[PDB]
Design an enzyme around this catalytic site. Structure first.
Site, PDB file in Angstrom:
ATOM      1  N   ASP A 186       0.865  -1.168   0.000  1.00  0.00           N
ATOM      2  CA  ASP A 186       0.000   0.000   0.000  1.00  0.00           C
ATOM      3  C   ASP A 186       0.906   1.224   0.000  1.00  0.00           C
ATOM      4  OD1 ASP A 186      -1.831   2.008   0.312  1.00  0.00           O
ATOM      5  OD2 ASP A 186      -2.800   1.196   2.099  1.00  0.00           O
ATOM      6  N   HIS A 197      -5.396  12.721  13.893  1.00  0.00           N
ATOM      7  CA  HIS A 197      -6.493  12.498  12.959  1.00  0.00           C
ATOM      8  C   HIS A 197      -7.620  11.619  13.495  1.00  0.00           C
ATOM      9  CE1 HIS A 197      -4.246  14.537   9.988  1.00  0.00           C
ATOM     10  NE2 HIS A 197      -3.306  13.614   9.892  1.00  0.00           N
ATOM     11  N   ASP A 200       2.499  19.555  13.386  1.00  0.00           N
ATOM     12  CA  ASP A 200       2.487  18.595  12.289  1.00  0.00           C
ATOM     13  C   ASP A 200       2.023  19.312  11.027  1.00  0.00           C
ATOM     14  OD1 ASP A 200       2.278  15.235  11.985  1.00  0.00           O
ATOM     15  OD2 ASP A 200       1.021  16.296  10.554  1.00  0.00           O
ATOM     16  N   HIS A 225       0.076  18.225   8.759  1.00  0.00           N
ATOM     17  CA  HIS A 225      -1.300  17.868   8.450  1.00  0.00           C
ATOM     18  C   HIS A 225      -2.237  18.478   9.480  1.00  0.00           C
ATOM     19  CE1 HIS A 225       0.897  14.590   6.302  1.00  0.00           C
ATOM     20  NE2 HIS A 225      -0.094  14.719   5.434  1.00  0.00           N
ATOM     21  N   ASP A 229       6.837  16.090  10.095  1.00  0.00           N
ATOM     22  CA  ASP A 229       6.662  16.141   8.658  1.00  0.00           C
ATOM     23  C   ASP A 229       6.515  17.566   8.153  1.00  0.00           C
ATOM     24  OD1 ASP A 229       4.081  16.473   9.733  1.00  0.00           O
ATOM     25  OD2 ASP A 229       3.267  14.675   8.767  1.00  0.00           O
ATOM     26  N   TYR A 236       8.504  11.647   8.485  1.00  0.00           N
ATOM     27  CA  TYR A 236       8.752  10.445   7.695  1.00  0.00           C
ATOM     28  C   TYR A 236      10.094  10.406   6.989  1.00  0.00           C
ATOM     29  CZ  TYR A 236       3.876  10.343   8.678  1.00  0.00           C
ATOM     30  OH  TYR A 236       2.678  10.338   9.350  1.00  0.00           O
TER      31      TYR A 236
HETATM   32  O1  LIG Z   1       1.312  12.512   8.822  1.00  0.00           O
HETATM   33  C1  LIG Z   1       0.180  12.192   8.675  1.00  0.00           C
HETATM   34  N1  LIG Z   1      -0.758  12.820   9.570  1.00  0.00           N
HETATM   35  O2  LIG Z   1      -0.300  13.730  10.547  1.00  0.00           O
HETATM   36  C2  LIG Z   1      -0.279  11.178   7.592  1.00  0.00           C
HETATM   37  C3  LIG Z   1      -1.679  11.365   7.255  1.00  0.00           C
HETATM   38  C4  LIG Z   1      -2.198  10.790   5.911  1.00  0.00           C
HETATM   39  N2  LIG Z   1      -1.264  10.697   4.815  1.00  0.00           N
HETATM   40  C5  LIG Z   1      -1.635   9.929   3.928  1.00  0.00           C
HETATM   41  C6  LIG Z   1      -2.665  10.588   2.994  1.00  0.00           C
HETATM   42  N3  LIG Z   1      -2.547  10.186   1.591  1.00  0.00           N
HETATM   43  C7  LIG Z   1      -3.674  10.692   0.789  1.00  0.00           C
HETATM   44  C8  LIG Z   1      -3.626  10.267  -0.697  1.00  0.00           C
HETATM   45  C9  LIG Z   1      -4.137   9.036  -1.110  1.00  0.00           C
HETATM   46  C10 LIG Z   1      -4.084   8.654  -2.446  1.00  0.00           C
HETATM   47  C11 LIG Z   1      -3.525   9.504  -3.392  1.00  0.00           C
HETATM   48  C12 LIG Z   1      -3.019  10.735  -2.992  1.00  0.00           C
HETATM   49  C13 LIG Z   1      -3.074  11.114  -1.654  1.00  0.00           C
HETATM   50  C14 LIG Z   1       0.107  10.459   5.207  1.00  0.00           C
HETATM   51  C15 LIG Z   1       0.597  11.237   6.439  1.00  0.00           C
HETATM   52  K   LIG Z   2      -1.010  20.648  12.190  1.00  0.00           K
HETATM   53 NA    NA Z   3      -7.104   2.529   2.087  1.00  0.00          NA
HETATM   54 ZN   LIG Z   4       1.397  14.701   9.543  1.00  0.00          ZN
END
Ligand SMILES: O=C(NO)C1CCN(CCNCc2ccccc2)CC1
Ligand SMILES: [K+]
Ligand code: NA
Ligand SMILES: [Zn+2]
Ligand SMILES: [K+]
Length: 642
Positions: A22, A137, A174, A176, A267, A307
């Protein structure tokens, strides 16, 4: 009074991982934890923290933030095989499950609660929990974005219930948006949530309309949710510090939290593949430092994302260095935030002007990747040297020291200087004063044995000259001077090597852009006015100036006592904390208060801040208008193009 920093970590939390292919989740790896802890051990920081054991959050504790139905569903994942774990994961957005992840989620939450207890019980001053899975989240009934349970929302709900706190600040740096935290406290005025985040006009995950600057909270919580969307990638140190100086800190110091919790995702650092920002790991040393005068230093840092294994370890170390009180690194190259950031900053300040006194004047017309390894940060053998008047003995903190023993060579330098520039002076006390200044300055600069110092003096003019001139020849490239008093000093601000901040009582017209003169109306609202000036004018200029030494000067003729400790603490973000304070006359309270803040002790809160008077705000915004073309870090609006 509490001392030490807790570090809460357990290898068990690295014992879950992704079990199928994934590309979206493959960045969330056990090594984020092990590489971070091993970097703290490599730099000797883990050894200097109080290790506090993890525990499991209890069922009752999880139910503070999550529904029984969600908890019961997650509680079933330890018994699932890989196919069942994949199908369970796909009910949620950007999240994977593992036989051990429920166990680890209870440890990440309990580790967070252990940190809150250690800090609120005064067993440590502050601390950090290196945990995974992250939390910000996760929502009442959903896992989301690598998060299973909401560690930081637990912490605030737990501190409210068990310590009866009325005001908690959550800072989510963060990259996000922590929508789980936002939803949890949307209507709660007792928890102030601040988040900056990559947004890109809602095209960046999690793609939410309510991550924009216009969500200020709901109902009784209106004003206690602050979203700062980044609408371009590549935000820099200047963008982050502009966010802190012009949005977060003004609100934070008015709110006056009783506890600060940081959702600390790294990040937001250079090299991270999800954030794509450009802030250096050293910026987190300063984001931590600038929050530490809040809540008497009671700060709980909780790991979220991050990351790029290299920038992750360096940013974790910069934070813990600051929690331990080590001198901050100098940040060079600062200037204006970029236009996109100034737009987000301007939009959030305007929507929030209904709610916060620092913004109220806006509402009326009257108005791969590579970067240099961070330098070493050594705590000074003696942090602070103090030179009280002759014969005055003081009880000093364990990391302070008297220092009156003028060397032989130093005493020859004083005779030199007297013969050349003050031939007609024999007051052998003022001449001892000059010996003290030179010997203290030499210890501060020529070595890492002393960090900063404070000298009581008789005559300002000759003391200031010798201090300033001795610092300039050493050489210190630039000197920041902060003067509380009236009249002119023997300070020349014409070569660009000196910036002069002066806090006075007579309104003196400002000429050049290397001086900031703040004449504040004396009265009940002097404290709020000074804090507004400090956060929105003095610190932005000082950080951009980037001095090698800070020289503080207090005229004997003092509503200082309320706020001099906060300035002294915050101004140690500059010049790696190397500050020399000259106090004219003996004042025991002021001397003890200066030494306390210089030595890294916790600062007592100001109490919730009343409002500054409009005459003072007008005065400060005229200073901004006059200076922001030269000093761009002062800007908190987009510039008018020709
Ligand atoms: O660091 C974090 N939270 O603080 C996480 C939160 C979610 N992320 C994954 C989101 N990917 C979305 C996506 C899916 C498919 C195509 C394009 C984009 C990674 C970092
Ligand atoms: K934030
Ligand atoms: Na999924
Ligand atoms: Zn993040
Ligand atoms: K809130």
């Amino acid at each position: 009074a509490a001392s030490g920093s807790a570090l809460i970590f357990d290898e068990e939390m690295s014992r879950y991982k992704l079990l199928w292919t994934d590309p979206e989740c493959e960045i969330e790896v056990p090594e984020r934890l092990t590489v971070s802890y091993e970097a703290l051990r490599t730099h000797g920081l883990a050894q200097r923290c109080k290790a506090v054991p993890v525990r499991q959050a209890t069922e009752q504790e999880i139910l503070l933030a999550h529904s029984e139905e969600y908890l019961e569903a997650v509680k079933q994942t330890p018994g699932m095989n890989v196919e069942e774990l994949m199908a369970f994961s796909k009910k949620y957005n950007a999240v994977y499950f593992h036989q051990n992840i429920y166990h680890c989620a209870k440890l990440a939450a309990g580790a967070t609660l252990q940190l809150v207890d250690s800090v609120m019980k005064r067993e440590v001053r502050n601390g950090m929990a290196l945990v995974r899975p992250p939390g910000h989240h996760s929502q009442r009934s959903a896992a989301n974005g690598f998060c299973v349970f909401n560690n930081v929302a637990f912490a605030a709900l737990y501190a409210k219930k068990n310590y009866n706190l009325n005001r908690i600040l959550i800072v989510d740096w963060d990259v996000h948006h922590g929508q789980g935290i936002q939803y949890c406290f949307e209507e709660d005025p007792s928890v102030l949530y601040f988040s900056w985040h990559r947004y890109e006009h809602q095209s960046f995950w999690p793609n939410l309309p309510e991550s924009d600057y216009s969500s200020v909270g709901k109902g009784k919580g209106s004003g206690f949710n602050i979203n700062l969307p980044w609408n371009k990638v590549g935000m820099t140190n200047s963008d982050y510090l502009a966010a802190f100086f012009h949005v977060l800190l003004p609100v934070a110091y008015e709110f006056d939290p009783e506890l600060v919790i940081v959702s600390a995702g790294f990040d937001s650092a250079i090299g991270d593949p999800e954030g794509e920002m450009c802030a250096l790991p050293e910026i987190f040393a300063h984001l931590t430092h600038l929050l530490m005068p809040l809540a008497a230093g009671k700060m709980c840092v909780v790991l979220e994302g991050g990351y790029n294994l290299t920038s992750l370890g360096q940013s974790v170390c910069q934070t813990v260095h600051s929690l331990l009180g080590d001198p901050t690194p100098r940040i060079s190259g600062l200037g204006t935030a970029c236009d996109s950031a100034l737009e987000s900053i301007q939009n959030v300040r305007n929507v929030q002007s209904s709610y916060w006194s620092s913004f109220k004047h806006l509402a009326q017309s009257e108005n791969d990747i590579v970067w240099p390894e961070p330098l070493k940060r050594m705590p000074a053998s003696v942090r602070t040297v103090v030179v009280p008047p002759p014969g005055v003995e003081l009880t000093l903190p364990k990391n302070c020291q008297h220092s009156g023993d003028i060397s032989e060579s130093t005493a020859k330098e004083v005779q030199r200087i007297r013969d050349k520039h003050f031939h007609d002076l024999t007051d052998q006390n003022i001449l001892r004063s000059l010996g003290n200044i030179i010997s203290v300055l030499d210890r501060m600069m020529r070595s890492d044995e002393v960090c900063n110092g404070c000298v009581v003096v008789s005559d300002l003019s000759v003391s200031v000259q010798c201090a300033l001139q001795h610092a300039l020849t050493e050489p210190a490239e630039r000197v920041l001077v902060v003067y509380v008093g009236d009249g002119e000093l023997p300070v020349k601000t014409n070569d660009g090597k000196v910036f002069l901040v002066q806090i006075c009582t007579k309104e003196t017209e400002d000429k050049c852009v290397n001086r900031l003169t703040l004449c504040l109306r004396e009265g009940e609202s002097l404290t709020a006015g000074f804090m507004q000036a400090l956060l929105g004018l003095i610190l932005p200029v000082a950080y951009e100036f980037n001095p090698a030494l800070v020289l503080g000067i207090v005229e004997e003729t003092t509503r200082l006592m309320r706020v001099w400790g906060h300035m002294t603490c915050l101004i140690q973000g500059l010049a790696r904390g190397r500050m020399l304070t000259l106090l004219q006359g003996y004042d025991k309270d002021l001397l003890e208060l200066t030494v306390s803040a210089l030595s890294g002790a916790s600062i007592s809160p100001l109490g919730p801040l009343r409002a500054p008077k409009p005459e003072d705000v007008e005065m400060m915004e005229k200073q901004r208008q006059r200076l922001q073309e030269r000093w761009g870090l002062l800007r908190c609006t987009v510039s008018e193009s020709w």
